[PDB]
Design a protein around this ligand. Structure first.
Ligand SMILES: Nc1ncnc2c1ncn2[C@H]1C[C@H](O)[C@@H](COP(=O)(O)OP(=O)(O)OP(=O)(O)O)O1
Ligand SMILES: [Ca+2]
Ligand SMILES: [K+]
Length: 430
DNA sequence: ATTATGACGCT
DNA sequence: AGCGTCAT
């Protein structure tokens, strides 16, 4: 009752760029705008691998991980943009720089947590309090929420998509109690107004469109964001959670899309997030551990306490390349040449990072995969990163991995290497 | 023969 | 530390 937490203390948003690498390429090349198109890396093997897909192309069934030759079977008129190649490898700099454009705009509105190259969480609790004080108790017009969906509405006693959106928004706003400054539903609504403003600023200042979720925590904001894509935002209220979760597959919730989520389903014999409410906290802890159990107990009730971390910059800067099938590295010279290519890209990015962000990496992590190994990484070793110098880093990387070579001939490398990875970590202020 | 990333948990 | 999981 009066002592039961409801997890309604914060307003959190998640902003997710729509088909991000495609938009970056469509901004640059207007011929690609409003077309079925995709972004591909490399071209020689089966036309290249697709890593991003426009919504026009998704209508034809084109997906990530598809080979472009195969995507062309579904969509013969599919347009393609290729990821830049430098030093023999895909180079993602254009997309990282475009990401910074968006993250810097978002940071004007609130503290952000960079979740990925094109996603950021926003803690809007303070901004909402501020806006509410401005508002001086005046109601919120639907005109302030032109791209907002209210999840679960309309409900109760037109056949167009936008019509339904407005119907739900009207029901929501009709019900709002705008004279209570501490009403969680009102706070979420003001949060959604701010996110409309944020999303308009992003589009105005970069050309890029995005979707967003607004709720009381990160998991719900993330879930909300995906409900109405692209170019829309969705408010998931605390009250919407029981119905929403009642048919929500467990794997849809962030962190439950893999083995843990499969185990929840198998061990408990349930399918939907809402079904978790029927277990005690101790029961859940008994199967999934103390941390996961407590997290699941609260999460299935719409409650999560994970903070929006004040972090706008990546914590690591890495460079990696696969060498699949026949291209696996089988000589010493090969391994050393590619470590150098990786180190040269890493040095370039590190030097830029040091100038931009007043920090220096102090640890170099070297990872490799050996042919035959099922795991993405076979071996990981660290050494000191004391100078931003590509020849030094590549020499150091070789040193920490060179005894992995089983070959009695040290000219040759065996078993052949199917992946190389250099990662700079442990930043200190500079 | 997806590939190139990146954060965080466990022991 | 080195490995594993989960995610864009
Ligand atoms: N598995 C991957 N491999 C390489 N790059 C990826 C992968 N997943 C995502 N990316 C890149 C390309 C994406 O444009 C970008 C953002 O990813 P993501 O948000 O999952 O999809 P998206 O932005 O392309 O479409 P959506 O509109 O569905 O969000 O990150
Ligand atoms: Ca996205
Ligand atoms: K994303």
């Amino acid at each position: 009752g009066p002592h039961m937490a409801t997890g309604q203390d914060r307003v959190v948003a998640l902003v997710d760029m729509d088909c991000f690498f495609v938009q970056v390429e469509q901004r640059q090349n207007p011929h690609l705008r409003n077309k079925p198109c995709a972004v591909v890396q490399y071209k020689s093997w089966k036309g290249g691998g697709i890593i991003a897909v426009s919504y026009e192309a998704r209508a034809f069934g084109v997906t990530r991980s598809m080979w472009a030759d195969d995507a062309k079977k579904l969509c013969p008129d599919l347009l393609l943009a290729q990821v830049r190649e430098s030093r023999g490898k895909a180079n993602l700099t254009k997309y990282r720089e475009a990401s910074v454009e968006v993250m810097e705009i978002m940071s004007r509105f609130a503290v952000i947590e960079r979740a990925s190259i094109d996603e950021a969480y926003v803690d809007l609790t303070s901004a909402v309090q501020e806006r509410l004080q401005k508002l001086q108790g005046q109601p919120i017009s639907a005109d302030l929420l032109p791209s907002t969906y209210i999840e679960g509405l309309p409900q109760g006693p037109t056949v167009q998509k936008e019509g339904m959106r407005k119907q739900g928004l009207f029901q929501w706003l009709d019900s709002l109690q705008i004279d209570n400054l501490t009403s969680p539903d009102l706070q979420l609504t003001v949060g959604a107004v701010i996110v409309e403003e944020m999303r308009a600023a992003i589009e105005r200042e970069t050309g890029f469109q995005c979707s967003a979720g607004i709720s009381h925590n990160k998991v719900l904001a993330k879930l909300a964001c995906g409900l109405n894509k692209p170019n829309r935002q969705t408010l998931v209220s605390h009250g919407s959670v029981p119905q929403l979760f009642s048919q929500m597959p467990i794997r849809k919730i962030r962190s439950l899309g893999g083995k843990l989520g499969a185990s929840v389903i198998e061990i408990l014999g349930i399918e939907y997030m809402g079904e978790l409410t029927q277990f005690t906290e101790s029961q859940l802890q008994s199967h999934f551990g103390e941390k996961n159990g407590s997290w699941l107990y609260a999460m299935c009730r719409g409650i999560e306490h994970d903070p929006v971390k004040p972090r706008q910059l990546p914590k690591t800067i890495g460079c990696s390349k696969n060498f699949p099938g026949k291209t696996a590295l089988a000589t010493r010279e090969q391994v050393q040449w590619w470590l150098l290519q990786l180190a040269q890209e890493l040095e370039e990015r590190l030097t830029k990072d040091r100038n931009d962000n007043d920090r220096v990496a102090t640890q170099l992590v070297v990872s490799i995969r050996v042919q035959g190994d099922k795991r993405l990484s076979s071996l990981r070793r660290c050494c000191a990163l004391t100078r931003y110098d590509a020849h030094k880093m590549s020499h150091d990387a070789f040193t920490v991995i060179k005894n992995c070579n089983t070959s009695g001939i040290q000219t040759e490398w065996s078993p052949p290497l199917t992946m190389l990875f250099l990662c700079a970590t442990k930043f200190s202020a500079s």
